[PDB]
């Protein structure tokens, strides 16, 4: 079984023609020893490479490439497994510096390559990070076979978000929600989860069905980071009254090629909207920044400081489920809902 | 003011080398008369072109190109306004057939171009169709200045979607939801709206703030198409018990560069989740497939057969708003909610 990788990256810093040449030289020497072939091109501070060989050797080489200080933002665009024929059998690593190339026909191709790479970067930011996950594992997302998988589903929202929109300039509202989305997404990702979408002011994320500990850790880490954010913001910053509620439940989600050819999606949680709205209501009603179902609680392996809060319905069936939180100094909180909303409005009014 | 367009398309059918040559010839002759310059490349059934000239002439030429039978799926990747210098001053239209090119350095570039175009096609399906809208109007989406704009917001969902997941194989569930998403998205788009996201089984869409008539027409068209779908499906098809509820409200949405660098979005409706859940609950409680607020009703200019149904809250404030629907043969419907859910389960159980 032969493997072929295509990837693109950005120069981590400015790189001379002689430095690019040196990259291609050691790459060629190492790949020759590995029986690996391919091509490396650069244009306007972007590297493109196709790399092909026995899968074991490719991954070790690829692991090395990801650690090179000379580039960053490495993106695997295609991974072919069980490759049958080499594209570049005579090139251990052929290097093509397009910046130095002045050939008649290659000039318009460089403009096209540039524009297409830039367009591609724009699209990267607007798609689920899981889509690139599927690609690096050798699968076209549009060919995923449908499957049902149990997940821990994460929902956070901003407390009385409507007050921000009523009290602040639109640019400042966006600043606040960007700070919120950035905190949530960074922490969820480092705990091994995936943000699947933003729904208004609400972040939706998945954790593997048996990673409750990571979903709880992520939730507490977010609450702690938001407390630090509120306390460390400048005087009069709107960030001082940025609060979140977080709910966790278990759901069976559907993975597959989902949607309308116009618009596609990789996953659906049926009735996500109702689960999110119900968790939102529980954080408000309970004055508790973190709530989660018994199914989440019993999936956890660590000895969290669990506290039982109440019964509720999360799915819409006539099933009363126990709602828990974590009892820690942070989550101890006497009045939420209307109390916090009034405070937010008073503060933001005088900003 | 000079304009420059970069676009890609797919051959609508197989095209010979001599036919591609003829395209480039008339393009060159017409552009010479228009004082327009550029380059056209083709590779493996894809056209790429850069076109540059006075904006008026470019658009007329571009309008012609969109109507050519010889290609389809035309996608503008970049539109530069107030261009200062031509890229290709000596080329009215230079044609470069990469399929016929066998040059040493161009072979790896063709592989890269191919892979990058394919990757780009995958990403196209997973991003808001509005993102490409912003690009063709000459703006990088990641540079949008934040703005607040009033919209008609559309929310539809599948009635007792959870029964499908409980009664059917996962592949058939996906079939059903794909049929649903395809109907909704096609009709919303032809009525001038934009689907912004799928949230579980729920479609979220915007119409311009004063296009209530189009949002109502789209809603009725979807209900009519689903009725036709249920009636025309084969015996035992799960599509026979595919029902939708639809809610419309007015909201102020925020447009801008929104999200977490990891994940970006072009728009947020604050508390979208709560508005959607409330409309979902109203369609259930009222046994009415279409509900909408008085703000939507009074925004309509046509003389719809409006019927007043009840008061509700949609936003969470202590504001009681009148809920309306359209009284027509279709929407006349005696029992929903638990009635329909039981029917769906019985039917799907015996499929
Ligand atoms: C853009 C780029 C492409 C590279 N391609 C390869 C490659 O194809 N093969 C390789 O062995 N190293 C490649 N490298 C360099 C590795 O990161 C690493 O420096 C090199 O393999 C030396 O490792 P070694 O001394 O353990 O053999 C590349 C580096 C950069 C910046
Ligand atoms: C891939 C492709 C690129 C084209 N590019 C141009 C072009 O740059 N300029 C142009 O006038 N026509 C171009 N055309 C053709 C137009 O669609 C149209 O056939 C042509 O302009 C003749 O119009 P006319 O007789 O009114 O001048 C292109 C067609 C295709 C399929
Ligand atoms: Ca909220
Ligand atoms: Ca109980
Ligand atoms: Ca539903
Ligand atoms: Ca009333």
Numbering used by the authors:
A (entry chain A), B (entry chain A): 0 to 350
Task: Quote the paper.
OaPAC is a recently discovered blue-light-using flavin adenosine dinucleotide (BLUF) photoactivated adenylate cyclase from the cyanobacterium Oscillatoria acuminata that uses adenosine triphosphate and translates the light signal into the production of cyclic adenosine monophosphate. OaPAC is a homodimer of a 366-residue protein comprising an N-terminal BLUF domain and a C-terminal class III adenylyl cyclase (AC) domain. BLUF domains contain a flavin adenine dinucleotide (FAD) chromophore and are ubiquitous blue-light sensors that are found in bacteria and unicellular eukaryotes. The BLUF-regulated AC domain of OaPAC stimulates turnover of ATP up to 20-fold upon illumination.
Tyr6 plays a key role in the photoactivation mechanism of OaPAC and of BLUF domains in general. In PixD, the BLUF protein from Synechocystis, the equivalent mutation (Y8W) blocks the formation of the signalling state, whereas in OaPACBLUF a Y6W mutation was recently introduced to dissect the forward electron and proton transfer following blue-light excitation of the flavin. To investigate the structural role of this residue, we have replaced Tyr6 by a tryptophan (Y6W), a mutation which is expected to disturb the hydrogen-bond network [Fig. 1(b)] around the flavin and at the same time form a photoinactive enzyme (Lukacs et al., unpublished results). However, the most extensive change is the ∼85° rotation around the CG—CD bond of the Gln48 residue, with the distances of the amide nitrogen and carbonyl oxygen of the side chain of Gln48 to the N5 of the flavin changing from 3.3 and 3.1 Å to 3.1 and 4.0 Å, respectively. The isoalloxazine moiety also rotates a few degrees in the Y6W mutant and displays an average shift of 0.2 Å, and the side chain of Met92 rotates ∼20°, whereas no notable changes are observed for Trp90, which retains a Trpout orientation pointing away from the flavin as observed in the WT [Fig. 5(c)] and previously published WT OaPAC structures. In particular, in the Y6W OaPAC mutant the BLUF domain is closer to the AC domain compared with the analogous distance in WT OaPAC.
